[PDB]
Amino acid sequence: KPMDKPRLVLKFIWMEKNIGLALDQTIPGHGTVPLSPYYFWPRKDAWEELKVLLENKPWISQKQMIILLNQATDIINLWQQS
RNA sequence: UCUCAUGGAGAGUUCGAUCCUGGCUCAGGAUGAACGCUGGCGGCAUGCUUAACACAUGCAAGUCGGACGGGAAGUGGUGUUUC
Ligand SMILES: [Mg+2]
Ligand SMILES: [Mg+2]
Ligand SMILES: [Mg+2]
Ligand SMILES: [Mg+2]
Ligand SMILES: [Mg+2]
Ligand SMILES: [Mg+2]
Ligand SMILES: [Mg+2]
Ligand SMILES: [Mg+2]
Ligand SMILES: [Mg+2]
Ligand SMILES: [Mg+2]
Ligand SMILES: [Mg+2]
Ligand SMILES: [Mg+2]
Numbered sequence: 313k314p315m316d317k318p319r320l321v322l323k324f325i326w327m328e329k330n331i332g333l334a335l336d337q338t339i340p341g342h343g344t345v346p347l348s349p350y351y352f353w354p355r356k357d358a359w360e361e362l363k364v365l366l367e368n369k370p371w372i373s374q375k376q377m378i379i380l381l382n383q384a385t386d387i388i389n390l391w392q393q394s
Numbered sequence: 395u396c397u398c399a400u401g402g403a404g405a406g407u408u409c410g411a412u413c414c415u416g417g418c419u420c421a422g423g424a425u426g427a428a429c430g431c432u433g434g435c436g437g438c439a440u441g442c443u444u445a446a447c448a449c450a451u452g453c454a455a456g457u458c459g460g461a462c463g464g465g466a467a468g469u470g471g472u473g474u475u476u477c
Contacts, residue, residue, distance in 0.1 A: 323470050334470090 316340055322380050325350050331391045333358045
């Protein structure tokens with residue numbers, strides 16, 4: 313049995329005045345399963361609840377969490393710029 | 395006495411009576427019928443003949459994304475699919 317890396321995919325919900333955030337997990341043969349539900353920014357703390365859900369799960373390595381937090385920070389800053 | 399024929403009826407009224415010419419009237423069918431009285435059901439039909447007179451409202455001709463450029467719904471994104 314080899315070692316498969318459960319790579320995580322980042323998703324967003326684009327609303328008029330709001331934007332939500334969610335994460336998925338991907339393993340070979342297991343396909344894709346949702347890791348986290350959609351958190352609506354600015355109304356809720358989206359990046360904070362996403363990284364809190366990635367910390368509560370011990371099987372997420374620091375690198376996979378920090379990459380998704382970097383591109384999700386780039387999308388929250390891109391929404392805030394608009 | 396083979397064959398064809400499945401078809402044609404009258405009545406009252408002019409005269410004191412009659413025969414005739416002659417009109418009127420009636421008995422029969424048919425309705426895209428109307429009105430009156432009365433009206434239980436089913437089957438198949440029929441239903442502005444008058445003003446080709448006016449029209450409130452709603453519907454009666456669209457379809458093709460496999461001609462085509464686009465944008466708008468979602469989706470995580472041009473992998474899916476819709477309008
Ligand atoms: Mg006379
Ligand atoms: Mg007399
Ligand atoms: Mg005569
Ligand atoms: Mg008759
Ligand atoms: Mg009646
Ligand atoms: Mg007419
Ligand atoms: Mg009209
Ligand atoms: Mg219609
Ligand atoms: Mg189609
Ligand atoms: Mg179509
Ligand atoms: Mg064609
Ligand atoms: Mg396509």
